[PDB]
């Protein structure tokens, strides 16, 4: 889970990655990349709180 | 300039529930003022120097904070304070106000009432087809209405209108109107309007045959 | 007790100019500043500025500096807000505000300002009761009001003299620019043989003013 | 949002009218060069620049740009278009990537402009196997840059130590050391199955405390691979 | 307040004279130079001269020297810009502006003086929305403005009552010396033969206006 | 005798970011003045005396510098302050005035939805055909079109216009207009409009057939 | 590189009123923590995470704010309350304070009771004669020491050091020291201490004659 | 080549109170940079690239500046401050340094202890008699030091030498030496030093006889 | 870490050459330009010149060109500075410094270069308290070390031993061209009988060390 910062920036903001590194043996490494499907009008959620 | 952000934009309580609407500014201002307003009327003066109430304010209300965080609160939510309310500052040119909370009142779920009316003739006659339907006396506002000509699923060509909440038990009316040339309306024999909402079970469907009589 | 009185809704054609007025009452009229702010149809509140009607002092939000003036006129306890070059941008409610600290304790009751070459008053058509609008006895019929500009209409039924459930859809705006709304009653179904209905529409903007008889459909 | 660039090779004016024997000042910062690494996976991925360059003189037809490795290379960048200088918020900066770079070696890298030491030009030192972009070199990876065999190395008994460690996929040969003041103890290894293994490397004196040292003999790297070291500690 | 009120625009044959007025009031006229600044269809700004309200006396840009002429009149609070011959080159906004120290303060709102040796009203064309469009969707219509001199048209829709989703674009400057451009709004395609679309066009110096209704095209 | 150079002549900012502009004098001057200018109003007073703010003026803004530097700053951009800043001097006669700095609201890329249409009848009876192809709300303002008229690309005989920003959505239009006389119209079929736009993976072409609803 | 400032240093309050402190952030931080420290023990968490209550702190104590301002609040004081509070952030390397606010108590005014003492044999001895001036248990902590030698106004030849709020009766007292060699001292007769504040109508004189018992 | 032009060149502030002190370039660069510098030790790269803070510095401190104009920022004075601040560019050969700030702290007015020392025995048996007179732990650095032997005042046979500020109270301390041949000093009798400062309301006298104990 | 290692204080004669040394560690020494900067006790920064370690390629500021030579040593990673003609001016603090862009990031520690042609050791002096320099229970006292060159001297009390108000007074130059500095320490005037007050005065170029015993006067 991520919070978005309520900030002017995230009115250009369109997409978050997210990289995991498994440190077991031998060592895993995947990112993902999470797509927003509209851009952000206001800072927070308008029914409270930080997207 | 000096930005009010107004939290939650939107919100309902229950009668008798506690209420808490903030105000953030962007910027420290010595005061913080709130004002009420009902639909079609003026905004009126509700609190004043961020914790005095204006002549008529009922004592559930009081406001509160300092520096750049300032919030109102109810008591106890009574139906009479369901309204948009603003907060407002001018520590600093230009006066600003913030972005408002609209505060509706919370009710048991009750389901729709569903009515369809078709096109007068008077409105043919002038090139156009207007298919209405109604979903009376229902709460949340949260519906879906979709339209199906001849079992066809409809798109892009309807506008939904939404009342205000009823003064007496709050529920909500809405009407679907589908709009289609003479021409479209008088090749398609089924209009049906199709109603999702939580008060029911199933989703309700309300139809007419054009050329009935 | 004190009033602010503003002027009435106009429709002024973009590029003429126009000056509303805000008439005080009940107060020593140069022991307070006047104050104007805008609400469009997007409901949130902008302030324009203000005036003191004592020394004429003026502050503006800039989003407004070069485009409303604000004036007073002592001897009738008034104050004015000026238009030079009216938009389409600037249709919207203009309401006139009293503080004297940095809160505002009596407002106008708003001017309605329309930037148009033209006003359209309404078609009015039936929403005609029929098995398919009854339910537990009571039928829903109607009158759809549609394709008239600039906001608002009224809509009585049977010249005042109907008591029944009423459901008033506010106005929608079409993609051409013209509204529309359904102003419908609820009605003991068993009446509709008996009792006429008779929808009471009236446009201000184009002096208009229409009754229409809804009549039940002769199909059940 | 900009005009483009397309870029080929051309010859060089000789490498005397880059590396001067004067200072140019510091903050002529026109011209920007980085190292990345091309290939997004984590196999031998190439190792190249990134030189950016920001363009008062008005209107341009090509950017030249020379790379020197101490090899001598240059590019002739011709733009598209033109715009008679910075339409977007930005200055207005381009980029080219190519020159793959070598390991340790001093770059010298000038750039002018056409029709136009240079006041564009910058220079840098590339690193070794250790760096986190050139470790990703197929040479590097190929010594065991990428190797991480997590030694942990207990002490069993008075002349016992035992080392456990995870093998690499490029080979099958380890010599495990130990050392204080001496070597202590050595054993050489054989293992074919990518796990984490264990292994009893007997010692002569005391080993808590002293430096394990893991040799791999990878074939690419005969000897000098890049070795492994930690410690012996006591067990749990 | 302080407003400065500048007369409307104006048409001149090409090496004609023409004379703007700039109206000041809400302060001492005598007390503050006004100053007459220029704006191209390039955008920058030009000062042309000032002049001290209190004697007349004047100072101009050299640029500009023996083509204007700055007076007042003390009586009626006014500053005057005279051209004695105004040609292509000096079409463009005209402002004039009060001074206090080395800033202008108060802008007047701009007078456009237009050099013209005729005038020429636009054809007014349809942009019918396209019938292959997509199931709902979104359908564009529009009108074209073409051959007009000299600017400017104006154009609303729907007699100004349709605002929303619409773009009239600058003009043109085609190759013949005429102008030209498009005003175009997008709509659901359902409401193409639902709704009607009218452009009004307006073109003031030539008197001409043209309402023009937009249709798909019709099939056969 | 002293002019004022500006710089950039154009930039576009992020919401949120800082924002500096220059104001480069040819020799030395005793203040420097900035005015704000929004498309098709007058030039206002923002900040003069090279760092006193108008009243109204956010205090975002700031302005600084001596002898023949200066700078107008943005502490973090907002939309509403997308306008064309001039800085003036008035230490020498003539006053003049920079060239402008014209600062432009940033926002997601957007793709233009692409419309084409035909010339009408009632032009083509006058002996020349318009063809014009619509590019609507898109961002950024950089784009390609090109006409195809039967595969053959055209050159020369059209031209463009775009919108400034919306003020709403910060958006532009572009239109892009192909003349013709009637007859070169007549002659070919198939009249194309390929679009180019970062916003798109892949160009975009809308098509008609002459004559053809 | 955050710098956090507090508002106001040092301040003081009635039991029952209300207090307000304020934390400032040079820029944008995602959480303030409050510490209370009074005088010889280890700072304690107080309000964390920008408005939480560390377990058993009052619940007369609140936090407030975002971005760079921020709040502690005291609905009602309370003698307990006395104390230092540091405002603290982690959002940015390096971990910072605030600088403090330091809050005592606000009681009536209450005049010093005066005392002087002449030095001790013991003392003169040495060479030296510290003559001691002792205010003790007044209120407000402002008070002005003037000593007087034969009646000659003395200066630079006198230190003061005053108390923290005493735990009981939150008053104040002060020492003022006047140090003379022991030959100037054997040269005068009459030593006076003249006492100034705020709960005295006329200023207080205590004095000695050297050598009186 | 680019000479940089500080101002002020020395200064005092108060701790918490905002400082600025401006650097003027002779032409333009592209870069200002800045460095503290304590007494005795290296500079500190302190403000690079106009406006970044090199790693460590407390964001009280701010560069900003363009052209020719540069200047840096302490949002509020603290203590350690206290130091010489130089700009720097390196746009143009030959990299110049400025010509510095020295950065002090003001404090409250405190009078000089005034002392004075006759030659010893062991410089007169040598040739040479320096008297030395003492002024301890005064502010501000102003004062006036006048020499009288037999009540003739004294010109261009003295010397002064000045502390840096304490690191404890922030004072200056001085010492004046008059220097005379062992001839003059045996032949007067009287040696005063008269030192004039703020702190004191009446300038203050230190004498000796040559010969007393 | 990166750390710019400097030689130790130097005293020359004028007229010999000495040759300063600047020893880096913790980064590539090739990527980095080497600055070197004198500060008189003017406290002024002078930049010298700068060089590139990767081929030797210097700039100098030109009031120090073939004064002072730049130099590298890739080997050992160190730059060296060396005045190969000293002059009595070129006694200072030398710095050198990393710059990478136009900025210097790291600083090396110093060095203090002193050209004197001759050295003199001081004579040292007491300065004995008394009443005369006794107030609110402090004793001055101090040491008068006098016409000494070159510089510097080093004063202590007690050897390190001494907790008390210390005043070292910079050094003044007298129109002998030979330095005098008084070293002043406050006490308490009740310990003037049973401690003792020691000052040590080092004076490295002369290799002479003095300790002074500071007591109070007393009549025969
Ligand atoms: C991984 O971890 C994360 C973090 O712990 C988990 O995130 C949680 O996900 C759930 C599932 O979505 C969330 O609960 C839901 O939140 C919805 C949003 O509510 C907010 O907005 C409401 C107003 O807006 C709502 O209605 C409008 C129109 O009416 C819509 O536009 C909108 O989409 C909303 O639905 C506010 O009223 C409310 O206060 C919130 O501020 C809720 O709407 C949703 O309720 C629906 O479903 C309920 C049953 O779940 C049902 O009772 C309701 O009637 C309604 O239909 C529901 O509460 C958590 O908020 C979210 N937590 C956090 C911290 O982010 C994630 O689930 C997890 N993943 C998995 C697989 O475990
Ligand atoms: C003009 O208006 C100002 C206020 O705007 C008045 O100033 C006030 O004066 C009254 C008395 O005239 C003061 O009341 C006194 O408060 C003392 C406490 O002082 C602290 O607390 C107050 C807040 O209540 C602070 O304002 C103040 O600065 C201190 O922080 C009490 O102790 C006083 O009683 C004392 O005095 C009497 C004799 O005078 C003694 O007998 C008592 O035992 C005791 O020693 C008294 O209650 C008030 O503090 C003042 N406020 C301010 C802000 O200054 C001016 O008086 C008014 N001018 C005129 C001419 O009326
Ligand atoms: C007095 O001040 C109040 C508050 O600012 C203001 O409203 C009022 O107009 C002022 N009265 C006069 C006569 O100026
Ligand atoms: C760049 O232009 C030159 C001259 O026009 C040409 O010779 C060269 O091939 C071009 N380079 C590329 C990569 O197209
Ligand atoms: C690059 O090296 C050359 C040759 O030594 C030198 O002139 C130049 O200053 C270097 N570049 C930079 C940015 O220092
Ligand atoms: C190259 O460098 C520039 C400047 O930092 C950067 O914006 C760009 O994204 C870089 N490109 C790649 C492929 O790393
Ligand atoms: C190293 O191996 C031990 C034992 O298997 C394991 O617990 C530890 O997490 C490993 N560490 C890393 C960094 O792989
Ligand atoms: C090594 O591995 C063996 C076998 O799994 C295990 O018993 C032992 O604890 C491990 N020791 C270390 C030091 O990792």
């Known amino acids: 889970s991520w919070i978005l910062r309520a900030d002017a920036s995230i009115r250009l903001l369109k997409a978050t990655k997210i990289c995991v590194m498994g440190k077991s043996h031998f060592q895993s490494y995947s990112c993902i990349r999470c797509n927003y499907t509209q851009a952000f009008q206001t800072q927070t959620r308008p029914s409270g709180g930080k997207w | 300039q000096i930005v009010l952000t107004q939290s939650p934009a939107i919100m309902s309580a229950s009668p008798g529930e506690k209420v808490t609407m903030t105000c953030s500014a962007s910027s420290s201002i010595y005061y913080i003022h709130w004002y009420q307003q009902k639909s079609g009327t003026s905004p009126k003066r509700?609190?004043?120097?961020?914790?005095?109430?204006?002549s008529g304010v009922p004592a559930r209300f009081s406001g509160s904070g300092s520096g750049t965080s300032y919030s109102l609160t109810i008591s106890s939510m009574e139906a009479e304070d369901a309204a948009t309310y603003y907060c407002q500052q001018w520590s600093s040119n230009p006066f600003t106000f913030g972005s408002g909370t609209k505060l509706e009142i919370k009710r048991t779920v009750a389901a729709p009432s569903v009515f369809i009316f078709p096109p007068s003739d008077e409105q043919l006659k002038s090139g156009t087809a207007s298919v209405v339907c109604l979903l009376n006396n229902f709460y949340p506002r949260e519906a879906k209405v979709q339209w199906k000509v001849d079992n066809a699923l409809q798109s892009g060509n309807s506008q939904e209108s939404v009342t205000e909440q009823d003064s007496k038990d709050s529920t909500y009316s809405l009407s679907s109107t589908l709009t289609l040339s003479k021409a479209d309306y008088e090749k398609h024999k089924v209009y049906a309007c199709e109603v999702t909402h939580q008060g029911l079970s199933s989703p309700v469907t309300k139809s007419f045959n054009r050329g009935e009589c | 007790e004190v009033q602010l009185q503003q002027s009435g809704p106009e429709l002024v054609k973009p590029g003429a100019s126009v000056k509303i007025s805000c008439?005080?009452?009940?107060?020593?009229?140069?022991?307070?500043?006047?104050?104007?702010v805008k609400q469009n149809h997007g409901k949130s509140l902008d302030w324009?500025?203000?005036?003191?009607?004592?020394?004429?002092?003026?502050?503006?939000?800039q989003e407004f500096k070069g485009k409303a003036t604000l004036t007073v006129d002592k001897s009738s306890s008034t104050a004015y807000m000026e238009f030079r070059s009216l938009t389409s941008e600037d249709s919207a409610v203009?309401?006139?505000?009293?503080?004297?600290?940095?809160?505002?304790?009596?407002?106008?009751?708003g001017t309605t300002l329309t930037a148009a070459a033209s006003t359209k008053g309404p078609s009015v058509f039936p929403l005609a009761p029929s098995s398919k609008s009854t339910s537990g006895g009571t039928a829903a019929l109607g009158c759809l009001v549609k394709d008239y500009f600039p906001e608002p209409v009224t809509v009585s039924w049977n010249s005042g003299a109907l008591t029944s459930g009423v459901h008033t859809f506010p106005a929608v705006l079409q993609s051409s620019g013209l509204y529309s709304l359904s102003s419908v009653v609820t009605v003991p179904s068993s009446s509709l043989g008996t009792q006429t209905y008779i929808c009471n529409v009236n446009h201000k903007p184009s002096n208009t003013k229409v009754d229409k008889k809804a009549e039940p459909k002769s199909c059940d | 949002p900009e005009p483009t660039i397309q870029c080929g090779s051309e010859p060089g004016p000789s490498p005397e009218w880059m590396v001067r024997h004067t200072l140019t000042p510091g903050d002529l910062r026109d011209l920007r060069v980085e190292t990345i690494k091309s290939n997004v996976d984590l196999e031998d991925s190439p190792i190249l620049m990134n030189i950016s360059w920001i363009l008062s003189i008005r209107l341009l037809k090509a950017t030249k740009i020379c790379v020197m490795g101490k090899s001598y290379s240059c590019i002739r960048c011709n733009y598209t278009q033109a715009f008679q200088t910075r339409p977007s918020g930005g200055k207005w900066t381009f980029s080219y990537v190519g020159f793959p770079v070598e390991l340790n070696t001093v770059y010298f890298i000038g750039a002018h402009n056409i029709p136009n030491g240079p006041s564009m030009a910058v220079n840098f030192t590339s690193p070794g196997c250790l760096d986190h972009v050139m470790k990703y070199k197929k040479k590097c990876i190929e010594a065991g840059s990428l190797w991480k065999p997590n030694i942990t190395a207990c002490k069993r008994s008075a002349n016992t130590v035992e080392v456990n460690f995870t093998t690499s996929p490029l080979g099958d040969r380890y010599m495990a050391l130990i050392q204080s003041t001496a070597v202590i103890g050595t054993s050489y290894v054989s293992e074919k199955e990518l796990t984490r293994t264990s292994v009893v490397v007997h010692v002569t004196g005391e080993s808590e405390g002293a430096v394990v040292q893991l040799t791999p003999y990878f074939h690419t790297c005969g000897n000098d691979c890049i070795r492994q070291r930690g410690t012996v500690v006591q067990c749990p | 307040e302080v407003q400065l009120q500048q007369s409307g625009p104006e048409l001149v044959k090409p090496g004609a004279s023409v004379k703007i007025s700039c109206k000041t009031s809400?302060?001492?006229?005598?007390?503050?130079?006004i100053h007459w600044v220029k704006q191209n269809h390039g955008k920058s700004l030009d000062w042309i001269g000032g002049?001290?309200?209190?004697?007349?006396?004047?100072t101009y840009n050299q640029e500009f020297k023996g083509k204007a002429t700055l007076t007042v009149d003390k009586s009626s609070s006014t500053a005057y810009m005279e051209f004695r011959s105004l040609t292509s080159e000096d079409s463009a906004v005209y402002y004039c502006?009060?001074?206090?120290?080395?800033?202008?303060?108060?802008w007047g709102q701009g007078t456009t003086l237009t050099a013209a040796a005729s005038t020429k009203g636009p054809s007014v064309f349809p942009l019918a929305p396209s019938s292959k469009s997509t199931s709902g969707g979104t359908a564009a219509l529009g009108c074209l403005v073409k051959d007009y001199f000299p600017e400017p048209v104006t154009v609303s829709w729907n007699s100004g009552a349709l605002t929303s989703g619409v773009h009239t674009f600058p003009a043109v400057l085609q190759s013949s010396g005429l102008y030209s451009l498009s005003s175009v709004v997008t709509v659901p395609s359902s409401s193409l033969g639902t709704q009607t679309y009218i452009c009004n066009v307006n073109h003031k110096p030539s008197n001409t206006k043209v309402d023009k209704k937009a249709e798909p095209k019709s099939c056969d | 005798q002293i002019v004022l150079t500006q710089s950039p002549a154009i930039m576009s900012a992020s919401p949120g970011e800082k924002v500096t502009m220059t104001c480069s004098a040819s020799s030395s001057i005793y203040y420097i003045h900035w005015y704000q200018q929004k498309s098709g109003t007058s030039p206002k007073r923002w900040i003069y005396?090279?760092?006193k703010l108008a009243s109204g003026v956010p205090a975002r803004f700031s302005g600084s510098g001596s002898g023949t530097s200066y700078s107008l700053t943005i502490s973090s951009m907002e939309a509403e302050d997308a306008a064309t800043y001039y800085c003036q001097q008035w230490s020498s006669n003539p006053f003049t005035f920079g060239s402008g700095t014209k600062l432009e609201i940033k926002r997601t890329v957007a793709a233009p939805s692409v419309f084409i249409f035909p010339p009408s009848d009632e032009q083509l009876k006058s002996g020349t055909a318009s063809v014009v192809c619509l590019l609507n709300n898109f961002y950024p303002r950089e784009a390609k079109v090109q006409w195809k008229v039967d595969n053959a690309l055209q050159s020369g005989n059209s031209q463009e216009s775009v919108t400034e920003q919306d003020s709403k959505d910060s958006t532009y239009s572009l239109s892009s207009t192909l003349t013709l006389s009637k007859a070169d119209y007549e002659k070919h079929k198939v009249y194309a409009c390929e679009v180019t736009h970062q916003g798109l993976s892949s160009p975009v072409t809308k098509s008609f057939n002459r004559g053809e609803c | 590189q955050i710098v956090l400032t507090q508002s106001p240093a040092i301040m003081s309050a009635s039991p029952g009123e209300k207090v307000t402190m304020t934390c400032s952030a040079s820029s944008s931080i995602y959480y303030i923590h409050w510490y209370q420290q009074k005088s010889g023990t280890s700072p304690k968490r107080?309000?964390?995470?920008?408005?939480?209550?560390?377990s058993g702190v009052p619940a007369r104590f609140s936090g407030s704010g975002s971005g760079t301002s921020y709040s502690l609040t005291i609905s009602s004081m309370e003698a307990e309350d006395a104390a230092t509070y540091y405002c603290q952030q982690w959002s940015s390397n390096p971990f910072t304070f605030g600088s403090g606010t330091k809050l005592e108590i606000k009681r009536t005014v209450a005049a010093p009771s005066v005392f002087i003492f002449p030095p001790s044999d013991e003392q003169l001895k040495s060479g030296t004669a510290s003559v001691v001036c002792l205010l003790n248990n007044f209120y407000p902590r402002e008070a002005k020491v003037q000593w007087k030698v034969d009646n000659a106004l003395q200066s630079g030849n006198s230190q003061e050091s005053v108390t923290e709020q005493d735990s009981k009766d939150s008053t104040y007292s002060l020492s003022s020291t006047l140090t003379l060699s022991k030959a100037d001292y054997e040269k005068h007769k009459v030593y006076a201490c003249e006492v100034t504040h705020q709960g005295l109508s006329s200023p207080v004189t205590k004095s000695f004659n050297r050598g009186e018992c | 080549q680019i000479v940089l032009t500080q101002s002020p060149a020395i200064m005092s502030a108060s701790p918490g109170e905002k400082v600025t002190m401006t650097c003027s370039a002779s032409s333009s660069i592209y870069y200002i940079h800045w460095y503290q510098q304590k007494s005795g030790t290296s500079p500190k790269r302190?403000?690079?690239?106009?406006?970044?803070?090199?790693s460590g510095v407390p964001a009280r401190f701010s560069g900003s500046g363009s052209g020719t104009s540069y200047s840096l920022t302490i949002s509020s004075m603290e203590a350690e401050d206290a130091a010489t601040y130089y700009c720097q560019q390196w746009s143009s050969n030959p990299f110049t340094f400025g010509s510095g700030t020295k950065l002090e702290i003001k404090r409250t007015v405190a009078a000089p202890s005034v002392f004075i020392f006759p030659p010893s025995d062991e410089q007169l048996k040598s040739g040479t008699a320096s008297v030395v007179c003492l002024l301890n732990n005064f502010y501000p650095r102003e004062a006036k030091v006048q020499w009288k032997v037999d009540n003739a005042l004294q010109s261009g046979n003295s010397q002064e030498s000045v502390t840096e500020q304490d690191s404890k109270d922030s004072t200056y301390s001085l010492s004046s030496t008059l220097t005379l041949s062992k001839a003059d000093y045996e032949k007067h009798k009287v040696y005063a030093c008269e030192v004039t400062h703020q702190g004191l309301s009446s300038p203050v006298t230190k004498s000796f006889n040559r010969g007393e104990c | 870490e990166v750390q710019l290692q400097q030689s130790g204080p130097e005293l020359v004669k004028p007229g010999a050459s000495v040759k300063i040394s600047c020893?880096?560690?913790?980064?590539?020494?090739?990527?980095?330009?080497?600055?070197?900067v004198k500060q008189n006790h003017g406290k002024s920064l002078d930049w010298?010149?700068?060089?590139?370690?990767?081929?030797?390629?210097?700039?100098?500021?030109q009031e120090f060109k073939g004064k002072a030579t730049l130099t590298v040593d890739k080997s050992s990673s160190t730059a060296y500075m060396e005045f190969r003609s000293l002059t009595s001016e070129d006694s200072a603090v030398?710095?050198?410094?990393?710059?990478?862009?136009?900025?210097?990031?790291?600083?090396?520690?110093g060095t203090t270069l002193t050209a004197a042609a001759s050295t003199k050791g001081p004579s040292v002096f007491p300065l004995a308290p008394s009443s005369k320099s006794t107030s609110g229970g402090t004793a001055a006292l101090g040491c008068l070390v006098k016409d000494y060159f070159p510089e510097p001297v080093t004063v202590s009390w007690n050897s390190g031993a001494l907790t008390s108000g210390v005043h070292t007074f910079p050094a003044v130059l007298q129109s002998s061209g030979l330095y005098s500095l008084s070293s002043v320490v406050t006490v308490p005037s009740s310990s003037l009988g049973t401690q003792t007050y020691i000052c040590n005065v080092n004076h490295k170029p002369s290799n002479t060390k003095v300790d002074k015993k500071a007591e109070p006067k007393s009549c025969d």
């Open positions: 502006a009060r001074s206090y120290y080395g800033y202008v303060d108060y």
């Open positions: 005396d090279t760092s």
């Open positions: 002049i001290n309200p209190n004697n007349g006396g004047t």
């Open positions: 809400g302060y001492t006229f005598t007390e503050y130079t």
